[PDB]
Amino acid sequence: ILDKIFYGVLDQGNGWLYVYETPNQDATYDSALELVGQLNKVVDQLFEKAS
Amino acid sequence: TKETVYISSIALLKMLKHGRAGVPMEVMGLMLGEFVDDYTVNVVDVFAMPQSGTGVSVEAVDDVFQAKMMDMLKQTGRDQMVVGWYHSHPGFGCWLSSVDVNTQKSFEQLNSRAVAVVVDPIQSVKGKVVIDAFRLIDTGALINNLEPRQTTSNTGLLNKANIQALIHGLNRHYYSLNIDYHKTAKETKMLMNLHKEQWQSGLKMYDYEEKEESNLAATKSMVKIAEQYSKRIEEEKELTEEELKTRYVGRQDPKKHLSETADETLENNIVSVLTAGVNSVAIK
Amino acid sequence: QLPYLVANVVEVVGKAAVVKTSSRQTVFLPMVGLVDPDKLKPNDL
Amino acid sequence: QVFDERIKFANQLHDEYLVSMRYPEDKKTQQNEK
Amino acid sequence: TLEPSTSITLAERQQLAYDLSISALLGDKIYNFGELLHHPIMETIVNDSNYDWLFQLLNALTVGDFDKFDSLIKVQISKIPILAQHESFLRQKICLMTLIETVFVKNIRMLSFEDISKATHLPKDNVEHLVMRAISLGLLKGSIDQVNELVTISWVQPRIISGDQITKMKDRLVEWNDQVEKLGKKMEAR
Amino acid sequence: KDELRLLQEPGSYVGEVIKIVSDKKVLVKVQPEGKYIVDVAKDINVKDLKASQRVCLR
Amino acid sequence: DKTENDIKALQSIGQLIGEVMKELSEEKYIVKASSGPRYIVGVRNSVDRSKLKKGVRVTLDITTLTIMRILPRETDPLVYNMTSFEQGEITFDGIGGLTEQIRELREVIELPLKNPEIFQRVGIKPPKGVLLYGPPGTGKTLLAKAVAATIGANFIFSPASGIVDKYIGESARIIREMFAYAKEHEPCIIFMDEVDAIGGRRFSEGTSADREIQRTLMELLTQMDGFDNLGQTKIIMATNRPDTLDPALLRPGRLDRKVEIP
Amino acid sequence: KRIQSVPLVIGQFLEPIDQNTGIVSSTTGMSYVVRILSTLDRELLKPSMSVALHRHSNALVDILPPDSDSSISVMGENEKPDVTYADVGGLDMQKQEIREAVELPLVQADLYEQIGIDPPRGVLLYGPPGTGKTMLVKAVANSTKAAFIRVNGSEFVHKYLGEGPRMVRDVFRLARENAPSIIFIDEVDSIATKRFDAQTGSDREVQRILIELLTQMDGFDQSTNVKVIMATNRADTLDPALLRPGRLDRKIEFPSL
Amino acid sequence: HEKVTIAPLVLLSALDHYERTQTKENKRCVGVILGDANSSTIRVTNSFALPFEEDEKNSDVWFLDHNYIENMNEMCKKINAKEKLIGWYHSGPKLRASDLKINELFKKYTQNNPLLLIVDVKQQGVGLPTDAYVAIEQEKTFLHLPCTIEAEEAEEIGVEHLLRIRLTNQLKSLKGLQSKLKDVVEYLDKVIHTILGKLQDVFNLNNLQKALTVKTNDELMVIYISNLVRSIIAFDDLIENKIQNKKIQEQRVKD
């Protein structure tokens, strides 16, 4: 499971098992990676060229 | 003086459709109406004419066919005097009709109000709807009734007038082309209810409901991938100039992805909020 | 049309005819009733 | 509930800004330029 | 109903009604035994001499007792189990039409196996197999739940019945007009 | 407004000026066609046109 | 009544004809008109994107520049320079005496064209080319028309004398269109003749006065080993001796079978 | 909608004049001044390329790719070959030499920058065809996900003059814009053979095919926009540019033992 | 069923013929449609009005001339050979013995089923002044067919020269619900079952909806993700104006 071969988790207390899907998430925060890069550079140029 | 033709919404669509078959092929039709000279001019209804071996010509007018139509056009009261003819030709810079030259001279003897209309585009219309007519002045435009008192006349400045090949004399004897369209009370409400920009009606409750929320099968499907498309469009152009100077030689690059992804997002939000906004009352 | 144009038929699919005129322009049109498949041949008017 | 508030938070800086562009531009365009 | 065509005497109308009676006994298609009552069939024939079979089975759907109808008939039609099997589908069918709006005004859809047990004269364990045969024959479309004992169907063949049915039908359309006065008037002010 | 003027373009080819005529009309050689004499514009001098001069012809 | 229908047929409007040079997109194709240079047109109606692709002959609209209908690809006449006939002609009586080689010929030709599962369970790839060589005029014509008669596929005769010329051109366009004809009609088999004239190995497989010879030898190899081969059509060549054929075509993958005509 | 719509024609761009103004050349033989697209200005406008125009109004539409498809000098191209990579054993001697000269410069080439050398622009093959040559190179393009173009020694051979060098330049023009491209050359000794005698008429192209083939290699600097793989069947000595490590790096000789 | 596509030129010319004849409310106008009925979508490429006389007080009084039909059909053969008679239209909201008996009269000259059209000259309510109706027997039963308005390329462009979102769909959707409220009321007083059988069938079409509550919040989740992109639209305008502001402060300096 730690090698990302079989996807699933067990139950030690009751001896049960659970269902675990492969994808853990979607692509959302990735779109913010481009916005944070422009606001940490261009914005610095906005104040310097104006002053 | 001259005559200002006033084609309504009914006559313009009929005279055009008759000449929309083929680029090289030429056809002809007959115009009917009741008016008086001294400006004003109307057209009631039109119908196409059969094509002879000469195509468009003066001998192509069938007096047998024309007499039978005027009897069949009397049932609805649209039968009137002959106000002219309309033809179909590919069009040129001057003398759009490749055959008719002096044929109007024989038309002026029958009716002095008769004109010859030629449709230049032949399904080339870009929305301007430019049609050409003709009237024989014969000897005139010197010490006589003054035509250019009405609208858009005395043209020919330098070498550029209309098509720019006609300049002053236009086709023959400076016929002083004047064309205007009008809409009556019935033509106003009918056209706006049929064709204005695009006709979505009759679906009005499903108009934007079926085209969007019910079309979600594949339209916006996988919105998470649709948002990924807006990411690649922005990341491409935003990467160009981060220094606010001249590097990659561009100007509107930051505004290219701005307007494209703005209308897409505006459509993504309106469709999504109206999914449950219709309120079909599902309950349980 | 009484001034007929000279043309050479390349192929007389079944009801469609392929003719190439002297203008170096080939057109695709279905066969009409005034012509016959044996009447359309090269070296013919 | 937080998502709907953060939509207007971004628009808060929009109305306090676009007005500030034309604010100086009056006296800029009124002066004679070479 | 055809006046000019099919002109027969009075004796042949009851003989044709006998064929109409035995036609609906072995199947539930095209409404039920009460469909021929609205048509001038049962009202045009006598109520005795075993011509009332179509009338007694209409009220037997709400009562839900086979012994009451079996006592008024003979051994000929009571020996075929198809008549007893396909009659239970129509008894629950009335309860199946209650899933939209009948009693509950909140349009809550729930079906308990104990309510249809006394109505269809069938035990609780055989309820799962009764609805299963309905989907196989194409009678009803939907899904069932054995764990929670819940049944949800799309539609069967909604009947021509009236009165309290059409009264509740208008109330559901009021909620459509209520949104015009609630949600509709708010969008007009925007 | 700039679109409507540029929507209909009659087209213009490229030609080379050959010689000038005392009639205020200049000879221009056309590569696909051949030498053809045109009329000079109002902002273009006919005397300033020399041999092998690239100009635009409508 | 037949006269009126013939008069109504004169009012119909025909269109032009062309061939797709390149596929730009699904709704836009780059074509070449027969009345002028290359054009780019659209689609009109009844357009099947599966049967219409780059190279498929189309009916071009003279007015709006659209594709009205769909037609098979034809450039050079395929019924004149190439001999095409329905099934075969010569029966198996004239090829008698070769039955030992005929049964082996049917297993490598007739069987894979009908039931490909024969070699699939064995694991061997079906042979593409089969060389029938012998004395001139002896067994070349008989064995050619007998294969198409017993199998039922059409008889395609493409002599090698109609490719290599001293005239400029006439190299690739014949093999490409021959591959296109066998692609449209699956039940077909291609036959050739006089391969010894278009062959020879030179030395380094270069070209000295070989301009039409080498372009033909290399193109025949790229058709079978390319991305698209003929699975329903087998290539047959007829010559005197295999020594007159390019060793590049003699390698496995192109010519897997050699049958000698005694 | 008025710029493109249904009607479209083929043209060749020549020189611009002003913004949204340029001089082009159509296929009819008559040049006209069209309206350059508002998107194309300078950096996006190529000096000479085949483009798309309007039938009547004559306005610029789109930039067409340098398609090499024609009726003369046709060079075959395979799209997504179905041959499985490493489907034939005994290639460990060759397969080890292929990865470093193919897989590394097309994928791991950033490692060559850490070394300080340019990646190999090609590799030579020596041996009888059919073994690790024909079907093998088609399977290598699968792992690299590159366009596989077939340019042989006996191809583009015709009696016409001038199309030989013209077609080779158009292929490199397309292979320069598209990085994932591979060009395999079978029987290179056909092209490598030079002129030892005067052929008088109709053969001028023996030397002409070496001009453009060596211009894309020795003409410019060392960079790989395409994989040029040559294969030698049997040759004694042919080395116009071929031997020495000027551009080509590895020479693969198929063991005969 | 089938479909019907009527060009706007047919309906525009059909209304003016009602005015040309000066027909009052006591009479109605009848005309013939021309087109191609062979396909599944019936299209009307031509029409002409007929001098139809009728008495409103007597359903047995009607006047239909068949001689004008034979002559007009022969005249159209020299105009367009692809145009044939696919049926006949008529005016007025009411369907009476005059319009039902003449349906078989045009059937003699019409190969396929004549297409019936009720033309509203006053254009009362919603859209579609003319509805598509087909004749079928089980008593005459007229079934409604979908009526779409579609024209040619130059036809739609030519009309635009003559005349040269969210709230729109909501206001049009509420009018449909109000028309249904009056639909059940007007039908209830008429009986005191066939239409109600189809209505009660489509009414049923949170046991299974317990997991269907999340899908409402899933779309609202993307809306905020879209608003994040929508905010970026104005975040560049926030940067775009400072691109000017740096040049704005360099103006007074040069003056």
Swiss-Prot record, chain A:
Coiled coil: none annotated. N-acetylated by NAT1. Belongs to the proteasome subunit S9 family. Present with 16800 molecules/cell in log phase SD medium. Component of the lid subcomplex of the 19S proteasome regulatory particle complex (also named PA700 complex). The 26S proteasome consists of a 20S proteasome core and two 19S regulatory subunits. Component of the lid subcomplex of the 26S proteasome, a multiprotein complex involved in the ATP-dependent degradation of ubiquitinated proteins. In the complex, RPN6 is required for proteasome assembly. This is 26S proteasome regulatory subunit RPN6. It comes from Saccharomyces cerevisiae (strain ATCC 204508 / S288c) (Baker's yeast). The lineage of its organism: Eukaryota, Fungi, Dikarya, Ascomycota, Saccharomycotina. The gene is RPN6.
Curated annotation (Swiss-Prot), chain B:
Component of the lid subcomplex of the 19S proteasome regulatory particle complex (also named PA700 complex). The 26S proteasome consists of a 20S proteasome core and two 19S regulatory subunits. Interacts directly with RPN8 and STS1. The keyword Protease applies. A motif (JAMM motif) lies at residues 87-100. PROSITE patterns: MPN (PS50249). Its EC number is 3.4.19.12. It comes from the Eukaryota. Present with 16400 molecules/cell in log phase SD medium. GO terms for molecular function: cysteine-type deubiquitinase activity; metal ion binding; metal-dependent deubiquitinase activity; metallopeptidase activity; proteasome binding. GO terms for cellular component: cytosol; mitochondrion; nucleus; proteasome complex; proteasome regulatory particle, lid subcomplex; proteasome storage granule. Zn(2+) binds at H87, H89, D100. It comes from Saccharomyces cerevisiae (strain ATCC 204508 / S288c) (Baker's yeast). SMART domains: JAB_MPN. GO terms for biological process: mitochondrial fission; peroxisome fission; proteasome assembly; proteasome storage granule assembly; proteasome-mediated ubiquitin-dependent protein catabolic process; protein deubiquitination. Signal peptide: none annotated. Residues 5-140 form the MPN domain. Belongs to the peptidase M67A family. Coiled coil: none annotated. Component of the lid subcomplex of the 26S proteasome, a multiprotein complex involved in the ATP-dependent degradation of ubiquitinated proteins. RPN11 is the only catalytically active member of the lid and serves as the essential deubiquitinase of the proteasome. It holds the Pfam family RPN11_C. N-acetylated by NAT3.
UniProtKB/Swiss-Prot annotation, chain E:
It comes from the Eukaryota. The gene is RPN9. The chain holds residues 198 to 387 of 393 of the full protein. It comes from Saccharomyces cerevisiae (strain ATCC 204508 / S288c) (Baker's yeast). Acts as a regulatory subunit of the 26S proteasome which is involved in the ATP-dependent degradation of ubiquitinated proteins. Belongs to the proteasome subunit S11 family. Residues 1-158 form the PCI domain. This is 26S proteasome regulatory subunit RPN9. Present with 12400 molecules/cell in log phase SD medium.
Curated annotation (Swiss-Prot), chain I:
GO terms for biological process: proteasome-mediated ubiquitin-dependent protein catabolic process; ubiquitin-dependent protein catabolic process. Keywords: Acetylation, Phosphoprotein, Proteasome. The keyword Phosphoprotein applies. Gene3D superfamilies: Cytidine Deaminase, domain 2 (3.40.140.10). GO terms for cellular component: proteasome complex; proteasome regulatory particle, lid subcomplex; proteasome storage granule. Acts as a regulatory subunit of the 26S proteasome which is involved in the ATP-dependent degradation of ubiquitinated proteins. This is 26S proteasome regulatory subunit RPN8. It comes from Saccharomyces cerevisiae (strain ATCC 204508 / S288c) (Baker's yeast). The lineage of its organism: Eukaryota, Fungi, Dikarya, Ascomycota, Saccharomycotina.
